[PDB]
Amino acid sequence: GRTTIAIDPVTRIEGHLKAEVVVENGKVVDARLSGGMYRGFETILRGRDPRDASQIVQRICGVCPTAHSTASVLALDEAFGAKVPNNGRITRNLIFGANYLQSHILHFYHLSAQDFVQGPDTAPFVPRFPKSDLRLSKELNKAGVDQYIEALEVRRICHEMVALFGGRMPHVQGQVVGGATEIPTKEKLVEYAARFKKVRDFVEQKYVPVVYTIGSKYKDMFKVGQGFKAALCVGAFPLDNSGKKHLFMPGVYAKGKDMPFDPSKIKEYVKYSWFAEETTGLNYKEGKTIPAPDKAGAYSFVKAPRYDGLSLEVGPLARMWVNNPELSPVGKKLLKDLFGISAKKFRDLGEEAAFSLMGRHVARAEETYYMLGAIEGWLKEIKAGEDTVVMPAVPASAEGTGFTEAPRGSLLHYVKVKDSKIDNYQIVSASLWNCNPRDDMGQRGAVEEALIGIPVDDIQNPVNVARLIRAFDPXLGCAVH
């Protein structure tokens, strides 16, 4: 028989989300995700000095504000014709890269780990489900708790790294159209490197190993949550000034095939979203945001983006699958020792295990290790004292698009300027790609589809529903804006 389970709020994510699932014979057979809070940044932005956008857009999301900063300044750079000095490009990478480290560590320990680890006997770690399916030994659970506590310090240090050249965090002051506002000094680069060493040691010695080790006690979690097995990456982190090369290269993967990314193929649908029907199916260059909170049939403030008709996911798994880097040495070792798996590159996990509840946690840990090498490279490349900004005039009429990868997945901002003010501003964010509702054809969003098949052997303790959701690291502020 059927049982319908509603969870609102889904906790240990960012923002406001309701999940409703239908369970039959011990498994999820249908799902609906509802983003329940709207602000309307795309309309708030209209009429402003375009340079204000790179501050205003950060308040979409205080967990990933550097991603919005980056997409906004890239869009403004294009619109204004600003030529960011090479040293400013690298400085921006140091600011934004440091928040990838913060965000992944925050996500695994402070958002996700309580799915597998019992915290101390005080709020906010209790009360919780009577049968929470917490499988770790006394020793391994204690390591989880000890690392959660250590990670509070490590993620704070990552924000110090962000602030060194970014001013403060949340909400950097240091990225603007034309580059970065503060030239790195020798002294502050020493400070960044010292903090980075501490973060590196934590990532290498604690975080990557604990994800594989906990994963090895939850091997069943690699066999569910596949969904569409379809992914998007739009590219991120310019490694030179020519723009021909990025740390993450763009690509689409669906139905077992790699394909190029063509942004003209993005459309946003709204049949099941609380927006005016006449705005359905628009590419972001012609995007419109007209709220309709009373529209019959709709169940979310998240629009439904589709790529050439496809429902895709984004995030570390998407990027790691598309780019297929070598696995970390410790990952290779623990895959063999704890799982009996021989792997060299990320795709060697196989499609099924990669696109899974636990595979998404593994991808995020591997990507964190990957980012260490990128930041190390930027610290070698940066030049103390070299100018990081130009000061371009505001255009009367212009347009620009900025594409990057936020920690949770693909992000683009589009801006059109008319009479020297913002005429239109459109945002297509990572958790929009993951946590969206059905499109006009009835095709589910990525997380909705990934919920299908999730086991619920105990309807009174349906812990795997939110476990699956948390693997995607949702932030509904980003999704709805």
């Binding site: 906790t11 309701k18 009429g47 340079r51 906010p124 060194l164 506002t181």
Partner: protein
Amino acid sequence: GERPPVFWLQGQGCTGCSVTLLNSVHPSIADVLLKVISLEFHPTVMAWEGEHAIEHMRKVAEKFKGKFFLVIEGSVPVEADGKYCIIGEANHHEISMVDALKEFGPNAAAVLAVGTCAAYGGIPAAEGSETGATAVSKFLGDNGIKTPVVNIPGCPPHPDWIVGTVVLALDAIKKNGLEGGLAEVVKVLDSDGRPTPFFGRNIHENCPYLDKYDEGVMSATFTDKVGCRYDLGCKGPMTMADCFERKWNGGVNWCVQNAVCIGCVEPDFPDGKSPFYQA
């Protein structure tokens, strides 16, 4: 002594107030959670979820009626019968931010409106918005709720302003009891409801570049750190905060050193502080 129960409800916020709090140095967030407060409901970090989390809050609220601290982050949108912010569901009934504040507001010892959105409306209430985003104090007043409100603004606030205001309250309550203590807190609020220990001093009059301002020596590019930032848009003259001294993120930088102040703690943020990059 016993740590006071705290519920953290987010309306139209970005979670920046939670993230900023995680960056607290002294005390650390671990010490705040384990030694200073009992954070009984906070959807971003708590173990439980959904209706169970809501019911846990309601049970604690009943046991500590009149005694719990309610942290409200984000503005409260009143348009469309509250539908622009749904924070939970229990008994097959959705719970809007409007609903939640009407339920818990009257029974809190005090409401701490954290962040400029909650304090003053902020970006969700700015020009071009259409959700009826409302500041906490206005919403409570419009609904006859007399619970004391303390504003701790900023976009985001510094962690020290949030933790420090909690400690201000705890010290006062230890000395005077709950009602007498909160009265002593209200006595150190400015006309915008902000505690004077953190918001009683002006950025500009305390700024290390004030001499350059007086001399008319203005930077023409952000990266010129010698001149005053006024022509680049600095709103320090109109801003009451102690950022010049405590700085940000473990003291490693602050907005005027790095770029410009955007006046994020002020009731007219953002519109009255915009455009950000011209005077």
